[PDB]
């Protein structure tokens, strides 16, 4: 299995309740698609270097995950992540 | 790939001779040892020593130079080739530079010089001219 690091920027105005449901939702997407979420933790709430979907602040949340290259967990995360209004942006990278 | 180890041996001697190297090494073979011996006793090289190794052995040749480091060997030419084998009959045995050089000939009596071959009145495959 390959190791991926997922970092996505949550809109800075999200409620604490909505964030918790949001974070839970995107762990369940990966768990459901054959991926082991080795960790997932809010990193920081930071000013953005430029406007991103109208926002200049964001809450960066990092997920560390493992899964086979064949599994659809990463693709499924990317699909639902783009549609989501709360998630401004995300990047999925392989890590060692 | 290497298709003519004899021609490789002659060229290694030619190239080392050109820059007047003291010694030269080559992968060993029976025919290469035969040629080295003839160069030894005909006065073209100073010595030849053999090294037993794990692959096929190594033959070390000691090149010969006269007073003022004049080259004893002027050049060496491969005559018979994989692409065109050359055979001479006893009466066709060549003389190289009117006898000042030698031709190394492979015969059923062994690998010998042109002088020896026409003494025994036999031909064979012409390996190389040396002068």
């Amino acid at each position: 299995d390959t190791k991926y690091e997922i970092m996505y920027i949550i809109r800075p105005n999200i409620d604490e309740e909505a964030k918790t449901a949001l974070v839970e939702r995107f762990d369940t997407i990966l768990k459901d698609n054959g991926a082991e979420v080795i960790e997932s933790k809010d990193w920081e709430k930071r000013r953005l270097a430029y406007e991103m979907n109208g926002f200049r602040e964001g809450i960066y949340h990092i997920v560390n995950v493992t899964s086979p290259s064949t599994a659809g967990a990463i693709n499924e995360f990317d699909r639902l992540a783009k549609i989501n209004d709360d998630i401004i942006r995300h990047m999925i990278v392989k890590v060692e | 790939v290497m298709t003519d180890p004899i021609a490789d041996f002659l060229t290694r001697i030619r190239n080392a001779n050109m820059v007047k190297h003291e010694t030269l090494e080559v992968p060993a073979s029976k025919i290469k040892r035969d040629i080295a011996e003839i160069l030894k006793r005909e006065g073209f090289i100073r010595d030849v020593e053999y090294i037993e190794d794990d692959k096929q052995g190594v033959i070390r040749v000691f090149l010969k130079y006269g007073k003022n480091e004049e080259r004893v060997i002027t050049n060496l030419k491969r005559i018979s080739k994989p692409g065109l084998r050359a055979y001479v009959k006893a009466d066709e045995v060549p003389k190289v530079l009117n006898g000042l050089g030698i031709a190394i000939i492979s015969t059923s009596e062994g690998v010998i010089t042109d002088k020896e071959a026409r003494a025994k009145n036999i031909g064979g495959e012409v390996i190389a001219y040396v002068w």
């Binding site: - | 005909e42 006065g43 073209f44 006269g66 004049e70 004893v72 002027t74 530079l97 009117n98 006898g99 000042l100």
Partner: protein, 163 residues
């Protein structure tokens, strides 16, 4: 280095070439002379000279040639063995010939061989026939001729063992 003195050298004009340098005012025509010099006893040389007149050009050519003498090995009336002289375009094959067969050579090669004292020799010019380069090619071949005694000494053999 073969010392010109003590030798009775003879001269042979091989070629006289009229050459032109182009100048603002027209053309500066000169003569370039190629001369072979030799003692007809085994020493031969060649030289070139340029001058506004033929006699002056030949003199310079002769003086140059004497400074560049070489000795040719010689067995009787012919050369010890076959040799191929190559210089630039020139390519000269020279072979020993039987006694009395004469100098079967053409062009400038004849001058070199006759002034060197070779009387019987077969040769063929295989390359360009520009006189300067064939003469140069010839001497390159003659400088490759070897004496049996020198070959035997270098190989640590008697002349009989070699032959």
């Amino acid at each position: 280095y073969i010392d010109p003195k003590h030798l009775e050298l003879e001269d042979r004009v091989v070629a006289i070439n009229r050459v032109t340098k182009v100048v603002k005012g027209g053309r500066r025509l000169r003569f370039a002379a190629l001369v072979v010099v030799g003692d007809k006893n085994g020493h031969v040389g060649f030289g070139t000279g340029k001058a506004q007149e033929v006699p002056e050009a030949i003199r310079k050519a002769i003086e140059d040639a004497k400074k560049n003498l070489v000795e040719v090995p010689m067995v009787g009336s012919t050369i010890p063995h076959e040799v191929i002289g190559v210089f630039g375009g020139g390519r000269i094959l020279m072979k020993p010939a039987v006694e009395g067969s004469g100098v079967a050579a053409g062009g400038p090669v004849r001058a070199v061989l006759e002034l060197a004292g070779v009387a019987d020799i077969t040769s063929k010019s295989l390359g360009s026939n520009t006189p300067i380069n064939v003469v140069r090619a010839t001497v390159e071949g003659l400088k490759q001729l070897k004496r049996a005694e020198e070959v035997a000494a270098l190989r640590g053999k008697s002349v009989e063992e070699i032959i």
